[PDB]
Design a protein around this ligand. Structure first.
Ligand SMILES: [Mg+2]
Ligand SMILES: [Mg+2]
Lengths: 244, 240, 212, 231, 195, 204, 222, 233, 235
């Protein structure tokens, strides 16, 4: 019958690894690099679009950076279509929490929920896992500014600075070298762009190949603002930091 | 629904998916449990391949199931969250219906039952997780320490370790732990637990976590400096 | 119907009448209104006879499964809650119960829970349920002390049912007595109300309103 | 070979190997004999033990007051099929106040076994059955195969070495069909039939199992000292 | 059950609840505690139909205790009250609704403020300086409207509460067998054992 | 017994020259018993304002529901929802509960951010849209409000004149209803400024 | 509106002796003021030395007896032809009745036989399954006419020994099977005189260690 | 739960020495309107059974289709379908009784009263009743509706108990049945003059008589009856 | 791959045959039936000295009159025990009596072949079910994952089974006392165990009509071990 054609997506190898998870991670290593850096006064998200065209409408385009709510955003590395399925689920979870408790969802609770959904596809159902790694940038009044990552296995961890996608080994070494705890957002903006500039597979880093976002308490008094940078604004910050 | 039998017998009478789940446990960071006369200590290894980590928010290795019981693990981190959530729900359900918190043995028996179920249910794979469950029964001062594994078997231990290089630290515990006289104080128990991890860990810096559980819901996690003082005193006695 | 149960120094006394009626017709004078759930737990029958019988012998099965699984005697708290949670599921469907779940364990001591078909579950020292409950409460409230002897407590329960049997038309027949200890319940006989009334009247001097 | 992985696959010569393998389980089973006259029907079964400390596995199952069978092969499969027969006999009595005809019982067993030979996921039954009964058309004997094939016979045998008993019954056909109104002689013929299938071992008091049904005889099973009379 | 009262003063919330349980003809108990601790700094009193009251309260208690263990964090009184409101708003369009009215008294440790929420069985929530359910408010609100100040001490709150209970004992037809009084503040929950 | 008059309350909305106004009382009650004088019935999602009268549990539930839905709308559409679009969403959401409805009387008010056009709308408990040019009324004193608005209203009132008109419409209507009053709020809405005013009124 | 219930009249009586038990019932079946049958058996031999009657609404009565007979059959199949004891049968019938707690069998059930010590046993059930072992039990239409007579003549209630004037009760001496049958016949003859639904015939099933025996007696047909 | 719309009145029957007799009129009433005048309410099953039905006619037609299907089904894989394994009266009744009780237990009854009349394999007379409630009973005489009140008293004068059955010939039994049908026509407002009668005998088999009429009626005495009391003219 | 319910060319179910191999790797369990009672004994086989051996539970109560011992993948036994306990208690609820030992065994064995593509595989554990009832007296059954159960006068399962069964063949007779059976189980367990037998690595139990099912204390078993040593040194 049908058993003949079943790939068995949820089995261990003899070494105790999950085949499909490992192969999904291999897929993600070819995606455009995304970086997150956490500072005392905010968080930076920077990400590289994959080999673009001059005829691509950039100002209406979104493939890397997504808003989950007013306090939490994500950077994507992997299959964009897979990511949008999970993103919509996360947006709904955040609203469910807000309706139930009348408070914004704490960052970790949202991260744990999405990660549990990823885990399920590795243990039951016989379906392929989601080929996506997320960087979560968010703020709540318990832990303040927070950075997380999750991968197809459904495992998640917290970070001061982190990269996903292509050239993470090189990127992480550069971040580990220049990152300091008392760093500020404007310094973190520069570090993120400098790291992408060195790790990129492209010839030069220009505005049309980047997506950028900051989460600042640089919002008038005790509140948080998300800023998804416009193409012209990415062009200006590239000149300011002296990359173009 | 997806019904495929993933866990099945082989000609030699082995269930390979369950045995391969144990290989995932072997890969996980080391976890150790030691019970004294009036306490239980859970020690955990943190691999230092990951720095630039935010230790405030990163998932901790020891989890409270209730105010009087804790659970640590070795193996797949994502898998362990599912067992921890189920155990927490069952702990509250037990309080709701029996009007008494779970015994450590009952909670162990439940988690072990969940693990067994995932070895002969269609369309699912076994958990790649072994657990150490420790605590004190309500209104009881006798220390409790249990172990579970992917197959679903469980048992009580005077001291036990799981995860990578657990063969080495079990060797240490088997010659250093006396049953007639267990670590009489918290100090002695923590010292023996840190000593056992130092056989395997590397640097005694942010690589060792220690959690002490005492009777009547008295649970506390030691800080870096407190553990660092044990690390210092152990090697200064060793230089002799 | 009249059923009572009270806590005291020596454990629990359970006392019930024996009469069942269908309208004015006396169907039976030999009804067993104490259900022997197991050798350590007792339940009383009021409201629906079947509902009480069926679900309290069912309760005995659940208690037996609990001690097989946990290797320990079930608490009165846990036993009473299994029954109250069950009847709460059926709320609205028309179950009729009013029962006292009685037991004596190490951790709790003597314990009585009133369990009801609306879902009510109350711990208490003295409970009295049935059409003759008010009559039995009077004798209980005015004579109850914690430091009663087993002999005097047994009589107090017997006397309180007799009071109800006399005044309440739907109570009578005979009195069944039980004494619940930590090592289990002990049956203290069936006492015909007809014979008991005259015996108590003479020996006690009570019921001067009645000619004998 | 490449066509025996499941019951849903024909071989190039039109064979169903999983069904044939299920048939093989019957051949490994212990011998049991069935035979009938015009007044009675008899089952004789050689029970098999695990060792000298063990009991002898029961072979005969009662289905109704007028019907029952003997088994050879997977015993749990006989329990499933006999339970189904008990239910069908029972449905007939409760709904129609009618004792279920032995022939109709055979048709129902055929159809139940067939469904397990044409669908994915399932497996064929691994047991053979000999059904005896007395209904409105007299005594009957049926042979059930897990392929679905059910056959009405004067006598037969299934299990290991059943060929010896089957040849004996084929010789004795004209004699034992005439044994009317004499239960003891019909059983004697059945005990003599099953003896043609024995090697090294003989019929003892805890080895032998006999069942009979007839005109004024409810289906009854004889074991222990009740069969010493026939040893 | 019958009377449940609440008052939020300067630094604490005080809940008062009657002790009587009546099975139609007889008073079966005169020491019943109509309250459940949801978390160390949050208390819920309740009244409504028999059985459903305790079943609902314990169900809420179990859920908040589950949240506390999962997150290692105590939810704010506002968050707990919203969770409870949603459960009752869900319940009112069920096959058989929970016939339960509650008061939630909590001390918010983040804002350092006491908070009192009144929720009825329909899922109608209001935050109040003082509240009640049933007929309790009909007798007590005119006294509370007169004497209440936002800067009252806990002792002044208890005294104003005594005046409310005295008016209830005078003009109510039912004997509710007195009240159990509990205080919720920065240090947690405690019972006033002489009232 | 009648769910739409257990708690009481009123909402009124009006259009003016390049502006809209929406107003409500502050009472919540249990029939005769006054329970709260701070129960506001007007909510806003971006620049779109929604007033809701009727059963108070449903008022709270629907606010939470439309906050839920307008937040997801904004994340997907990358813009704030407009009054015309939100009106259709309210109607759709109410009709999905056709045979088990929310016992409410919603009112929408706002200015379209692109055309600048003032907009108001009303609904019955099951979604029927009333899109009036002049005014919309709702609640236990809707008859009284119809009487006030029909005489007091004139088109193209300036923002500060519209405030006086809608305030007097609410106040005098509420004072002829037992289940309305205990305070009042008025929103004056222009294209990029909104002023909120609490009114002084009798407290019986 | 459709009424799923009816009343077929009838009266039944079960008495337990020292080493025997009788279960008797009239053979008349009725609706309203009409006679359906003058001989419609109401007491049944259910196997394993157990006799049963389910009096009231005859459709429910026939259904219950049919299901219990079936339960005896399957008890033999499932438990190696073990004899179903009278106490085990009683508990089983409780579950059959309570299974329809919210749409009950509209019958009053009585079973009779011998217990595991060979002593006479009678069990009595309400429509929803509450049951009791009893010495003496009448059921159905004329139960109220029969029970007080049995209290007096079987249990000797209100009877005292002459000369003592109320001080010494009449001793409860054991009754023979012949003595019990006399009381059964007189009970039904008296019930026939005063209850319109009782008459036509009386069928008695007697249970001893030897098995189940039947006796039939004519009753007045008016 | 429903209400009967088009209905059939009494079915009457009795046992005699060698078999059974059953009869029913040919009317289908619509309330007080005598709407349909050619309705057959006796339905034979094989050559040994006749099922007589009263009450709702739509439900009768449903039961008729069930019995037709029962004969078809019994013949399937049955070489003795016309011999030892033919449908017995007792099989047909038990099946109907099962259906009737099941339908009342779902609160959706077949609104009928049914009498199954026939002769068994061993020659024994079969006569049993079942109705919308699932109630069953047997008697030497059986009748439904009005027949129960008026026919039974007359038929019981012929066969009063079991021992009267061997003493009752087929001529005496048929005579009694025909007279009862006349009495019902005099006194039941929902009856007709036209009826069907069936005899099932162990020797002569099934005799089915259609288009019978009530005859030998007494009406002449009506001419002398005047007024309601005092009127003479 | 191939079906989980597939027959081999020899007419055996692959998965059932493979589960029997897992049972051969399990620790030894022995049962002996006498007219004075049935004895059950097991090898505990702790994997490490730090493992508290009294937490090893391979002998289990099903009801007061029925006990059970296990060998193989012991985690698989938990749902079988749960079902057995439920079946025993349920029958008492329905029939106000004890359930027959055979009937209990049959109910457990009905679970066995409920696997396919129900549970995904057969059970990897064998059970010795011992008990008493009024009809058939003291009984011992061997329940397999095939669904088959045999009654035995004496039986051994697990890794040392064929050596133990040969020993039981010689030693069992119909006049054995309970004391003689206890020593016999200890003697044969000692013979087939890897480690030296003591009260901490072996466990005894019995079922009698009077006292029901009882697991023996370590102190009680220790005395029986000392009694065994002396009587073997006596010749
Ligand atoms: Mg006023
Ligand atoms: Mg009469």
């Amino acid at each position: 019958g049908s058993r003949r054609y079943d790939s068995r997506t949820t089995i261990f190898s003899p070494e105790g690894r999950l085949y499909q998870v490992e192969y999904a991670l291999e897929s993600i290593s070819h995606a455009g690099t995304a970086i997150g850096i956490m500072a005392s006064d905010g968080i930076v998200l920077a990400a590289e679009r994959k080999v673009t065209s001059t005829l691509l409408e950039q100002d209406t385009s979104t493939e890397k950076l997504y808003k989950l709510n007013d306090k939490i955003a994500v950077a994507v590395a992997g299959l964009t279509a897979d990511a949008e399925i999970l993103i919509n689920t996360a947006r709904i979870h955040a609203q469910n929490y807000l309706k139930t408790y009348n408070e914004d969802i704490p960052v970790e609770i949202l991260v744990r929920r999405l990660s549990d959904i990823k885990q399920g596809y590795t243990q039951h159902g016989g379906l392929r896992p989601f080929g996506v790694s997320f960087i979560y940038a968010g703020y709540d009044d318990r832990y303040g500014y927070q950075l997380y990552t999750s991968n197809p296995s459904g495992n998640y961890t917290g970070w001061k600075a982190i990269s996903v996608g292509a050239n993470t080994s090189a990127a992480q070494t550069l971040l580990q070298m220049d990152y300091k705890d008392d760093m500020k957002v404007d310094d973190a903006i520069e570090l993120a762009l400098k790291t992408l500039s060195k790790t990129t597979d492209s010839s030069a880093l220009t505005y049309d190949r980047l997506e950028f976002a900051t989460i600042r308490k640089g919002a008038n008094d005790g509140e948080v603002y998300q800023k998804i940078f416009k193409p012209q604004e990415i062009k200006d910050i590239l000149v300011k930091t002296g990359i173009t | 629904g997806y019904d495929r039998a993933l866990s099945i017998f082989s000609p030699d009478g082995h269930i390979f998916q369950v045995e391969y789940a144990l290989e995932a446990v072997k890969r996980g960071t080391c976890a150790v449990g030691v019970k004294g006369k009036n306490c239980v200590v859970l020690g955990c290894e943190r691999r230092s391949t990951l720095k630039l980590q935010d230790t405030r928010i990163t998932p901790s290795k020891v989890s409270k199931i209730d105010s009087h019981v804790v659970l640590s693990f070795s193996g797949l981190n994502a898998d362990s969250r599912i067992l921890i959530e189920k155990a927490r729900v069952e702990a509250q359900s037990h309080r709701l219906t029996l009007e008494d918190p779970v015994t450590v043995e009952y909670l162990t028996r439940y988690v072990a039952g969940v693990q067994q179920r995932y070895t002969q249910s269609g369309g699912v794979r076994p958990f790649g997780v072994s657990t150490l469950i420790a605590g004190f029964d309500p209104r009881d001062d006798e220390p409790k320490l249990y172990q579970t594994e992917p197959s679903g078997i469980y048992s009580s231990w005077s001291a036990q370790t799981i995860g990578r290089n657990s063969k080495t630290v079990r060797e240490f515990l088997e010659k250093n732990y006396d049953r007639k006289e267990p670590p009489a104080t918290v100090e002695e128990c923590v010292k023996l637990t840190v000593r056992s991890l130092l056989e395997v860990v590397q640097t005694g810096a942010k690589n060792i976590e220690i959690t002490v559980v005492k009777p009547d819901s008295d649970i506390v996690a030691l800080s870096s400096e407190e553990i660092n003082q044990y690390v210092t005193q152990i090697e200064q006695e060793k230089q002799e | 119907t009249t059923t009572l149960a009270f806590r005291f120094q020596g454990g629990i006394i359970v006392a019930v009448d024996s009469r069942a009626t269908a309208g004015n017709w006396v169907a039976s004078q030999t009804v067993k209104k104490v259900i022997e759930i197991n050798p350590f737990l007792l339940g009383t029958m009021a409201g629906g006879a079947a509902d009480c019988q069926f679900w309290e012998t069912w309760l005995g099965s659940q208690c037996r499964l609990h001690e097989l699984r946990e290797k320990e005697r079930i608490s009165v708290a846990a036993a009473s809650k299994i029954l109250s949670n069950l009847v709460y599921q059926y709320k609205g469907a028309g179950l009729s119960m009013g029962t006292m779940i009685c037991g004596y364990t190490r951790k709790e001591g003597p314990t009585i829970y009133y369990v009801d078909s609306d879902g009510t579950r109350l711990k208490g020292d003295i409970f009295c349920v049935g059409s003759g409950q008010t009559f039995a409460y009077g004798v209980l409230d005015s004579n109850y002390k914690w430091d009663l002897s087993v002999e005097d407590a047994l009589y107090l329960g017997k006397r309180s049912i007799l009071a109800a049997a006399h005044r309440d038309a739907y109570s009578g027949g005979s009195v069944n007595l039980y004494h619940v200890t930590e090592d289990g319940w002990i049956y203290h006989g069936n006492h015909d109300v007809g014979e008991l009334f005259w015996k108590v009247k003479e020996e006690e001097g009570s019921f001067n309103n009645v000619i004998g | 070979n490449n066509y025996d992985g499941d019951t849903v696959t024909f071989s190039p010569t039109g064979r169903l190997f999983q069904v044939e393998y299920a048939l093989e389980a019957i051949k490994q089973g212990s011998v049991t004999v069935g035979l009938r006259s015009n007044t009675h029907a008899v089952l004789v079964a050689l029970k098999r033990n695990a060792d000298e400390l063990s009991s002898y596995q029961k072979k005969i199952i009662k289905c109704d007051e007028h019907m029952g069978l003997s088994l050879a092969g997977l015993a749990p499969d006989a329990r499933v099929l006999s339970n189904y027969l008990r239910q069908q006999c029972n449905y007939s009595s409760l709904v129609f106040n009618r004792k279920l005809a032995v022939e109709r019982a055979g048709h129902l067993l055929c159809d139940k076994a067939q469904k397990n030979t044409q669908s994915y996921g399932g497996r064929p039954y691994g047991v053979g059955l000999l059904i005896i009964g007395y209904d409105k058309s007299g005594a009957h004997l049926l042979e059930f195969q897990p392929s679905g094939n059910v056959t009405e016979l004067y006598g037969t045998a299934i299990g290991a070495r059943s060929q010896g008993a089957k040849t004996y019954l084929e010789r004795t056909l004209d004699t034992f069909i005439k044994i009317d109104g004499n239960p003891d002689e019909l059983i004697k013929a059945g005990v003599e039939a099953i003896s043609q299938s024995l090697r090294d071992e003989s019929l003892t008091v805890d080895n032998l199992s006999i069942a009979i049904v007839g005109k004024d005889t409810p289906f009854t099973i004889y074991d222990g000292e009740a069969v010493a009379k026939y040893i | 059950m019958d009377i449940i009262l609440g008052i939020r003063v300067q630094d604490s919330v005080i809940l008062a609840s009657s002790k009587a349980v009546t099975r139609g003809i007889s008073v079966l108990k005169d020491s019943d505690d109509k309250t459940r601790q949801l978390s160390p700094h949050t208390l819920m009193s309740f009244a409504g139909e028999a059985g459903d009251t305790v079943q609902f309260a314990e169900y809420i208690q179990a859920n908040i205790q589950l949240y506390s263990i999962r997150e290692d964090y105590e939810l704010s009184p506002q968050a707990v009250s919203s969770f409870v409101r949603q459960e009752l708003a869900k319940s009112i369009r069920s096959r058989r609704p929970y016939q339960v009215n509650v008061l939630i008294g909590g001390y918010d440790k983040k804002k350092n403020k006491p908070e009192l929420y009144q929720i009825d069985y329909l899922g109608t929530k209001v935050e109040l300086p003082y509240g009640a359910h049933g007929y309790s408010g009909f007798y007590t609100f005119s006294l509370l409207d007169h004497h209440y100040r936002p800067d009252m001490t806990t002792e002044e709150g208890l005294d104003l509460l005594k005046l409310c209970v005295q008016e209830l004992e005078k003009r109510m037809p039912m004997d509710f067998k007195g009240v159990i009084v509990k205080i919720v503040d920065k240090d947690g929950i405690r019972q006033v054992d002489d009232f | 017994s009648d769910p739409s008059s257990i708690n009481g309350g009123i909402v009124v909305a009006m259009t003016g020259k390049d502006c809209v106004a929406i107003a409500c009382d502050l009472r919540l009650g249990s029939q005769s018993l006054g329970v709260s004088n701070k129960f506001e019935k007007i909510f806003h999602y971006g620049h779109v304002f929604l007033g809701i009268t009727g059963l108070a549990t449903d008022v709270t539930t629907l606010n939470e529901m439309f906050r839920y839905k307008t937040n997801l709308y904004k994340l997907k559409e990358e813009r704030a929802i407009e009054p015309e679009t939100f009106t259709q969403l309210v109607s759709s959401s109410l009709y999905e509960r056709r045979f088990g409805p929310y016992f409410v009387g919603p009112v929408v008010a706002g200015i379209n951010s692109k055309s600048g056009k003032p907009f108001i709308a009303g609904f019955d408990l099951i979604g029927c849209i009333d899109e009036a040019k002049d005014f919309i009324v709702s609640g236990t004193a809707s008859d009284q409000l119809f009487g006030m608005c029909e005489s007091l209203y004139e088109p193209n009132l300036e923002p500060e004149d519209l405030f006086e008109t809608i305030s007097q419409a609410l106040l005098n209507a509420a004072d002829r209803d037992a289940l309305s009053g205990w305070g009042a709020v008025v929103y004056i809405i222009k294209k990029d400024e909104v002023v909120k005013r609490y009114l002084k009124m009798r407290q019986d | 509106q459709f009424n799923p219930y009816g009343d077929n009249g009838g009266t039944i009586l079960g008495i337990a002796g020292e080493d025997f038990a009788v279960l008797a019932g009239d053979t008349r079946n009725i609706t309203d003021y009409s006679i359906n049958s003058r001989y419609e058996p109401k007491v049944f031999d259910c196997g394993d030395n157990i006799v049963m009657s389910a009096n009231g609404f005859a459709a429910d009565g026939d259904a219950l007896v049919k299901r219990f007979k079936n339960s005896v059959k399957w008890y033999h199949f499932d438990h190696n032809d073990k004899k179903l004891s009278i106490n085990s049968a009683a508990r089983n019938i409780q579950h059959l009745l309570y299974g329809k707690r919210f749409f009950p069998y509209y019958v009053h059930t009585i079973i009779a036989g011998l217990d595991e010590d060979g002593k006479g046993a009678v069990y009595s059930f309400d429509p929803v399954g509450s049951y009791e072992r009893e010495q003496c039990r009448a059921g159905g239409a004329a139960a109220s006419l029969i029970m007080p007579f049995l209290d007096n003549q079987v249990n000797f209630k209100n009877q005292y020994e002459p000369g003592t004037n109320g001080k010494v009760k009449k001793p409860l001496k054991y009754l023979s099977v012949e003595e019990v049958i006399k009381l059964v016949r007189d009970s039904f003859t008296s019930a026939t005189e005063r209850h319109i639904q009782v008459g036509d015939g009386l069928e008695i099933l007697i249970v001893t260690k030897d098995g189940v025996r039947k006796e039939f007696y004519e009753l007045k047909r008016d | 739960t429903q209400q009967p719309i088009v209905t059939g009145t009494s079915v009457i029957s009795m046992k005699y020495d060698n078999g059974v007799i059953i009869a029913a009129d040919n009317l289908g009433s619509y309330g007080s309107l005598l709407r349909f005048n050619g309705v057959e309410r006796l339905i034979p099953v094989g050559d040994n059974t006749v099922v007589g039905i009263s009450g709702d006619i739509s439900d009768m037609q449903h039961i008729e289709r069930l019995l037709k299907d029962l004969v078809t089904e019994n013949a399937y894989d049955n070489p003795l379908a016309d011999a030892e394994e033919a449908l017995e009266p007792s099989y047909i009744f038990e099946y109907l009784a099962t259906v009737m009780y099941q339908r009342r237990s779902k609160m959706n009854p077949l609104w009928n009263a049914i009498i199954v009349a026939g002769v068994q394999s061993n020659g024994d007379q079969f006569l049993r009743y079942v109705n919308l409630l699932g109630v069953t009973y047997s008697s030497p005489t059986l009748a439904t509706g009005f027949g129960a009140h008026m026919a039974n008293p007359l038929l019981r004068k012929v066969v009063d108990r079991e021992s009267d059955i061997p003493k009752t010939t087929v001529q005496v039994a048929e005579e009694a049945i025909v007279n009862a049908m006349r009495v019902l026509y005099y006194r039941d407002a929902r009856s007709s003059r036209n009826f069907s009668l069936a005899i099932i005998d162990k020797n002569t088999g099934l005799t089915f008589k259609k288009n019978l009429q009530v005859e030998n009626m007494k009406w002449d005495f009506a001419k002398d009856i005047k007024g309601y009391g005092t009127q003479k003219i | 791959d191939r079906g989980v319910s597939t027959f081999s060319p020899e007419g055996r179910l692959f998965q059932v045959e493979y589960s029997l191999e897992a049972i051969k790797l399990g620790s030894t369990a022995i049962g002996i039936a006498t007219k004075e009672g049935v004895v059950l004994g097991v090898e505990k086989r702790a994997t490490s000295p730090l493992l508290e051996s009294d937490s090893i539970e391979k002998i289990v109560e099903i009801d007061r009159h029925i006990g059970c011992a296990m060998s193989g993948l012991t985690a698989d036994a938990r749902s079988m025990i749960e079902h057995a306990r439920t079946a025993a208690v349920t029958h008492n609820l329905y029939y106000d009596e004890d359930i027959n030992v055979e009937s209990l065994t049959q109910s457990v064995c009905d679970l066995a072949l409920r696997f396919g593509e129900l549970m995904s595989r057969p059970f990897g554990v064998a059970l010795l079910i011992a008990g008493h009832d009024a009809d058939d007296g003291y009984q011992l059954f061997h329940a397999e994952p095939s669904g088959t159960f045999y009654r035995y006068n004496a039986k051994a399962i697990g890794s040392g089974s064929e050596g133990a069964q040969a020993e039981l063949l010689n030693e069992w007779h119909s006049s054995l006392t309970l004391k003689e059976a206890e020593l016999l189980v200890l003697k044969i367990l000692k013979q087939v165990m890897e480690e030296k037998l003591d009260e901490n690595n072996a466990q005894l139990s019995c079922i009698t009509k009077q006292d029901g099912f009882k697991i023996y204390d370590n102190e009680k078993t220790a005395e029986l071990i000392k009694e065994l040593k002396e009587k073997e040194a006596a010749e």
